[PDB]
Every structure is written in C-alpha cells, then in structure tokens.
Amino acid sequence: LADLMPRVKVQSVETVEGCTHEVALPAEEDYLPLKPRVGKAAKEYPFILDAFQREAIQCVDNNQSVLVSAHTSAGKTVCAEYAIALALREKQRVIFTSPIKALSNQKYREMYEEFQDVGLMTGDVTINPTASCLVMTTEILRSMLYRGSEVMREVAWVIFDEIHYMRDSERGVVWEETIILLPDNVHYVFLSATIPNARQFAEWICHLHKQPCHVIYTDYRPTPLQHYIFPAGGDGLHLVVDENGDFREDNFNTAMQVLRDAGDLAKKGPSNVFKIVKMIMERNFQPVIIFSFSKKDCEAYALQMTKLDFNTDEEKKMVEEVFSNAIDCLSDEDKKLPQVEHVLPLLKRGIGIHHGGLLPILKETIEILFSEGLIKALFATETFAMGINMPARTVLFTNARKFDGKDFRWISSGEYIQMSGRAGRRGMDDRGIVILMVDEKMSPTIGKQLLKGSADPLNSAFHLTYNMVLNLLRVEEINPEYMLEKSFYQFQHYRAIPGVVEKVKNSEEQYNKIVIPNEESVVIYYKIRQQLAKLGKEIEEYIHKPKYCLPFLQPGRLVKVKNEGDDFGWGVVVNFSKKSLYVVEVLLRCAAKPAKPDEKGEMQVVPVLVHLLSAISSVRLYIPKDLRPVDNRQSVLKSIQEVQKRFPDGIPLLDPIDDMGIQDQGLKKVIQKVEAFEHRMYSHPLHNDPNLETVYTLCEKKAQIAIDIKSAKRELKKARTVLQMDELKCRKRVLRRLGFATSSDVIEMKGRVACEISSADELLLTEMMFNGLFNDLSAEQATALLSCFVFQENSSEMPKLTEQLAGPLRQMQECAKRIAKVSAEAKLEIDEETYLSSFKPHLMDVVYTWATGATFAHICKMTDVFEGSIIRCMRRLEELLRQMCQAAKAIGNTELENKFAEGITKIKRDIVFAASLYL
Amino acid sequence: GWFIDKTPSVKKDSFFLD
Ligand SMILES: Nc1ncnc2c1ncn2[C@@H]1O[C@H](COP(=O)(O)OP(=O)(O)O)[C@@H](O)[C@H]1O
Ligand SMILES: [Cl-]
C-alpha cells in the first residue's frame, strides 16, 4: 500500500545525574553524538549553569533543534538567550515567539536591555521590524508565513516560549499550524514544563522537518515546595507533601476527617481566607499569591484585608511614588476614575489584585509593585499564573473546583503544577509553600495524583478553520490535506502504526511458513469443529443458569467441569450451597489442576462455581456416606469407570428441554445447528484419518496467525486513517457554494478578502461585506457592529438598544442565518440558534458612544461589565478593524477601507490605548 | 451400582422449620 507514515527512531544520550537527554532522528540516518563546542561561547552567564542547561546549550552549539522540558523557574530562558546570542554573533536572525501579547511585551523588555538589537511585533505594536531578534506573538508569526517569505529571510532560529499554549483550544491551533509552516532549514528551541510525552513531540518535529530534535528533561526544582491542605472548618494546615516530594497519607487522611465532620448536619465571624493570609504574615510566609477563579471573589477577598496593613510607611511612600509616576501619563479626567481611587488604598496597605477586569495600566502597575516586593498579599486570577515568572514565597488556593460545561470538576494536576510553580523564589527562599483549601470530600488516590502526579500529557487540539483552508489554497505550494497529515494531532493517532505494520509482516511471514497443510479440505473440517465448539459453549450457558440446573444437582450426579480451558473430565456431586453465585462440591480427577492423560489420577473433592459445569448427566451413581478415606475416593473413580463402560456411546446427558425445562426458543435453533454440524463432521473424509490431529493442529496454528493479521490490519486501517477529512470536504463545500473558492480549489477574489480576517469569523464578515451591508452604515455604527465579532467572553444581560444600532444588528443576523443554513446544507454540525447568539451585542451601545467622543467615565456607567474587559474588547476591535481595512484593500474597495480607517481613529485615543508600561 | 434419575427435587418455599 501507499503508507507514507512516520519513520523516526529515538536514542538516549548519556548525561550526568540531574537531566535526561534523548534525540529523535530519522530512522534512515545514523545517530551522531554532539561534538564539543568550538571557540568561545556565544554567551556567558553570571552563575554556574545547571546540567540540563549545558546539554541544551550544546545542542544549539551543534545547530540542532531542542526541546527543553523543565519546571517553571528552573532556567529554561537561559537556553533561548544563548540561541539569540549565537544567531546575533553569527549575523543571523531570530524569532522569539510567545503565545500572548502581554508576555511578548515583557520579554521584549528583557531581550532589549540584554541584546538591544531586538524588535517587537504584536497585534497592537510594531517596534524595530528590521531587528535581528524579533519578539512576536504566534498569531503574528503565522500571519507572516502565509503572507510572504521575508518573515524568515536569514532567520536561523525560532524560540517557542511555553509550548503549553498548544493545549489551549482558542489559540492552540494557530500554534501547531505555525510549526507546520516553518521551513525545514530552520532550527527550533522549544521551552516547556515537565510533560510526560516530550519524546512524542520531538518525534513529531523530526518527522516534520526531517531534522534531528533533542529532548532535555529535568524534574529539578531550584526551590523545594511544601504542600499543605486546609480542611474547611479546620483550625490550621496539614502538611500533605514534604520537601522531598513524599506524600504524607498520615496528615492527609486526618485533614479530610476534619473536613468530613466540619459542615452543618455533620457536627458573625470572619473569613477563612482572611485567617489564612493573616497567619501567613505572622509566619513570615509573605509575599503570597492568593489564586481565585472569580474576579468578583478576588476583589472581595482582597477587600477583606483592608482592615489590616502589610506595608511599612517607607514602603507606603515607595508605593505612592511608583503609583503617581506610572499614572502621570494619564489625562486629568482619567485619574479620577473610580478604579484608580479604589486600588491605591489597597496598594498602600500592601494588598494587591490582578485579574483581566482591571485596566491594563493598573494591572501592569500592580505587576511592577509586586516584583518590587511592595505587595505582600496579592489576590490574583488564574491568568496571572499563565505569564512571565513573577514568583512569591507562598501560593494560596481559595477554591479547588472549577466550572466546566454543565457539571463541576476538580482542578487538574496540570493546573495545580502551573499555579503552585510560582511558590519558591530562586535565591530568596529556602522553600516555597503551597496551601490548598478544600470544601468537598476528596479521595486519597486523587489527592496523591493531584499533588505529586505528573502533568497532563501535551495533546494537540488541532482543528480546521476557514481562515486556514483559504490561506492554504492561496499559496500554490501547500494544500489543506498536507496541513492535516503533518499535524501533531494526526501524528499522535499515527503512533500505533509503527508497531502494527512490523507485526503484520513478521506474521505474514510466519503464516506462509506454517502453510504446509496436506490439503485444502482440512480448513473445512477445522471450521466445522470450531462452529461445534462455539455451539457447545452456547449450550453450556443455558445449562449454567442456576434456575435450570440447580434442581438436578442431587448427590451422586455425574457432571463435567471446565474452566478457562482445562477440564477435569467427569465428577460426582456431593451437595451444593450459596457462596459469597452458587457452589457445588464435586469429586474430580486431579487450587489443584486436573489429572494428565498418562496419570492414573486421584479423586479429590473440591468446591466449584456452578457456572463452570459444561454438561450434566442423567446418571446418579451411588456414593459412600463418609468420603474422608482415600480408598472410598478411589472406589468412586472405579464406579464411574464402570458407568463409562455401560455406556460406550457416551455418558447420557439431560435433555435441556424434555428434562431440564428450558423452554427458550434460542436454545432450539442451537441444538438444531449442533446435530447438523455433527453430521457434517462425521461425514468429512478427514474425521476417520489417524493424522487428523496432526493436521488439525497445524490448521489451528495457521488459523490463529490469520486472526492476528485480521485484527492487526483492522487497527492499521484505523490508525492510518485521517480523521478530519470529512470535515474538510464539508468546509470546502461551503467555500464552493459561497464563492470563496472554485470547484478546483482555486482561490476566488472573495476568498482573498476573507484571508485578511483572522481575529474573527472571516466567513460571515466577508459575506456581510460583499452583500453591501456596511455600505449604508456610518463608521461609528460600522465599528459598533463589529464589536459583536470580538466579544467572545460574554456572560451578562443585554442592554436596551436604539433603533440606529438594532437595524444593522438585525441585518447582520440575517446573513448569519444564511451562513448556518449553507453549513447545515453541507452537513456540518452547527446549531442555528447557537451561531446567531455567539456574537454578543452587549457593547454595541458602549462602543458606539465611545466612537462619538464620550469620556471613558461616561461609557462605564452604561454596563456592569468590568471596566478592563471593555478595554480588552476595544483592543481586539481596533485590531479587527485594521484587518477589515486590509480585506477591503485586497479588492481595492477604497470606500470601505476609508470607513474602517475612520472607525480606528474614533476609538484609538485616551486610556483605552495607553502605551504599555513595559514598551 | 448406578441408577438414572431424570426428575428433580423441590422445596415448598413457604415452610416454617423448627
Ligand atoms: N544556574 C542558575 N543559577 C542561578 N540562577 C539561575 C540559574 N539559571 C537561571 N537562573 C535564574 O532564574 C531565572 C532564569 O529565567 P527563568 O524565569 O527561571 O526561566 P524558566 O522559568 O522559563 O525556566 C533568572 O532569574 C536567573 O537569575
Ligand atoms: Cl561542550
């Protein structure tokens, strides 16, 4: 067949205790150990490098891609810096790509102060494009690879900070899509955390770019952690994991027992979080991060602490100075905002908050005050853990459960690893501490798997998108089929083919060797007996039914017993009773095993389950009263030997219908097939042959080898299958019907328009644009309408909308229905009501009034949505508008380009687009 | 010797033994 499957081996390089080194290679190539670096290093560091860093360095010295899998704060960034150093030293280019903008900004600050030849590129900012070392968001990098080749001109290295972003669903597809698009001549540095399938990843990179890829892994943690649990309604903390990483079941069970009886029915005041952060300051555990999955809970817990003060008057003066300096850029009108007033009292008292709801300038100001130690008790959301390493001495969890779908579920070990990794500062702490608050009973096994358990594997979330398909039809070198065959998602489901195909040939060889049966008629005999055996077992099941056989288990009844293959011939029952199922005590020929053919045998009474009886006879031979003696047991064996003689035709069996009473209709058709197949058996020319058993065993062997080939090919045809082709055929069908591309998969002008839209539903917007919906709108309502396309995170009640805004909305929803009907007409899994309601219009009025010139203060009164979520949306809208301009420019539609351009200016002003403090 | 029995046994299921 045409099996174009992966063919990659992996070898283990020897290294010093402290790290493990594997390298994934193409199988054809011969492994070659890294040779020592030649010449001075590319970068020296102000510390002694750890073993895992040296090995990764040696990879980059040898111009070979490497994946570094170490815990956060272990020193992964050291490796990337050496790559940047080496490429700059060699007058080559570098791209340090990060998944999030905010991280890209901070990394740019790092890279700039260190190398100075660096630039930045995100959806919001573009600094020094000609830099030799570009920090850029992954979204930007894929957009450049689809656009042109100058993105990678003279680029020798690409650094992927935190590959975990691939697990994400909203932006993990762009990550994987990017790696598939890079040229093979490029070398990669991947930075990750402890993942159990790091090898699988390197194997993919190796199968993908036909180049060796290394794996450096280390569980080294520069600061050991002590994990504590706090039972709800409990007075203090139980050490559940010590610094050595051992799980103390001693203190875990005693913690949950306090939890078991703590709640009402099992048996004002302050808060439990309050009491935990209080003892934290009294035990010198500060600074601490208190993670809360609800921004509303995050602000409450932080406000409870306003009663206390965690800062010295010196630190106060520092906080106030750092705060007033970071705000000076804001306009007088914006300094009076209520959020600016409400937070400064908490910062003065050493309390801080961090969540997506804050304003960007404040969120970053708090990040700065935290790195300065002026914030000793920070209540932050989960997002704060998915960012640059800003560690604390202590991490506190307010809740252990998170809402996902339509049911509650604990937090995964992967999430606990992520957030707890911030406890423990490199040189500042002898040991970071982690505190977990539980309110629901927790099994010990899951507690061990959660605190000490490895991180969840790194599995691809790759899926298809119209924006991806269209861009792949635009390039005349690649096709969407290629993108799927070369994805990590497909590589992981291609992972069973290696072992399967090798076994099929070896078996196919072993099958042709045992292919020595004298004649082909033998197979017919074999299949006949095989059927009789299947029928035989079916009859037994009816006789197993205790409702049918128990009445005939009188002492002395002859019974044949078989279990899992081996049998004990015949035997006599003595009595029966229940077990724990029923059990009968039966003499048999032999926890013992049956007697062999050459052995004369020795009778022994043993209890056996009733569902182990193959046949039951009509005969009841007489047994001695006291069966304890051995001589009596032999006497029974001789009595049955005489019964077998009185019936050479076979010991008579009970008619299951005439005698046992099984009136079931299925047993009728089974007994008919038995008599018919028994007639076929004795008719077969081979039945009489004395060599039958010699040829029936070679036939049984050749038959089993064939069974393996069948099941092996079965899973191989599954593993070899591409799973997402049906979706692709349906999505191409949608693009055909709507005119984005032709039946021959050639991009139409309409498709090139959609290509420019990546931050939203390209398909709906291009349809809206081509239908002339925007043509009648003003720039202020045009931009307000687009707000529905960048407000994915919506969970509030709608507002009262003016007719000037509902008009285009109703018009837009009409095109949305048409998009759904055609998708369904293509047999795509889509719910029409779900599609229309996905575009939340909640900020139509807010965006519209900001477009007209209203102050930020004025628009906040309009909606209860947290004020930071408004700015996050406006930033996405401005980025989307910029795309819309590129879309209209693709067809030269300058009148629409001028309208979106106008929308940009109307919203790009004041604090919404305040320059980041890190830039 | 040996004998052949194709008939089963029974229990009242309502009896009170003692
Ligand atoms: N061998 C080392 N010895 C002492 N400190 C180190 C060492 N390597 C890295 N560091 C420190 O840890 C940080 C390195 O960057 P880091 O944030 O830990 O990367 P990552 O967390 O992704 O692995 C720096 O603050 C650095 O001072
Ligand atoms: Cl070396």
Numbering used by the authors:
A (entry chain A): 92 to 358, 369 to 681, 693 to 702, 714 to 1042
B (entry chain B): 172 to 189
What's the paper's own text on this?
A central machinery in nuclear RNA processing, quality control and decay pathways is a conserved 3′–5′ exoribonuclease complex known as the RNA exosome (reviewed in1,2). In both yeast and humans, the nuclear helicase Mtr4/MTR4 is central to exosome function. First, it functions as an enzyme to remodel ribonucleoprotein (RNP) substrates with its 3′–5′ unwinding activity, and to present the unwound RNA substrate to the exosome core. Furthermore, it functions as a binding platform for RNA-binding adaptors, providing the primary interactions to transcripts subjected to exosomal degradation in both RNA processing and decay pathways.
The nuclear VCP-like (NVL) protein, also known as NVL2, is a ribosome biogenesis factor of the AAA-ATPase family that has been reported to interact with human MTR438. Thus, the MTR4-binding determinants of NVL reside in an unstructured region that is present in the human orthologue and more generally in chordate NVL proteins, but not in lower eukaryotes. To identify the arch-interacting motif in NVL167–216, we analyzed the sequences from different species in terms of evolutionary conservation. We noticed that vertebrates feature a conserved hydrophobic segment GWFIDKTP (residues 172–179, Fig. 3a). We co-crystallized the NVL W-AIM peptide in complex with a construct of human MTR4 encompassing both the DExH core and the arch domain (residues 70–1042). In the NVL-bound crystal structure, the arch domain of MTR4 is an open conformation, with the KOW domain clearly separated from the helicase core. The NVL W-AIM polypeptide chain binds in an extended conformation, similar to that reported for NRDE-231, Nop5336 and Air234. The hydrophobic side chains of Trp173NVL, Phe174NVL, and Ile175NVL contact Val766MTR4, Tyr745MTR4, and Val742MTR4 respectively, while Asp176NVL interacts with Arg743MTR4. The NVL polypeptide chain then forms a pronounced bend at Pro179NVL (which contacts Phe653MTR4) and continues to form a crystal contact, docking at the Trf4-binding site of a symmetry related helicase core. Western blotting analysis confirmed that wild type NVL bound MTR4 and that disruption of the 172–180 segment, either by mutation or deletion, impaired the NVL-MTR4 interaction (compare lanes 8, 9, 10). Taken together, we conclude that NVL interacts with the KOW domain of MTR4 using a short linear W-AIM sequence.
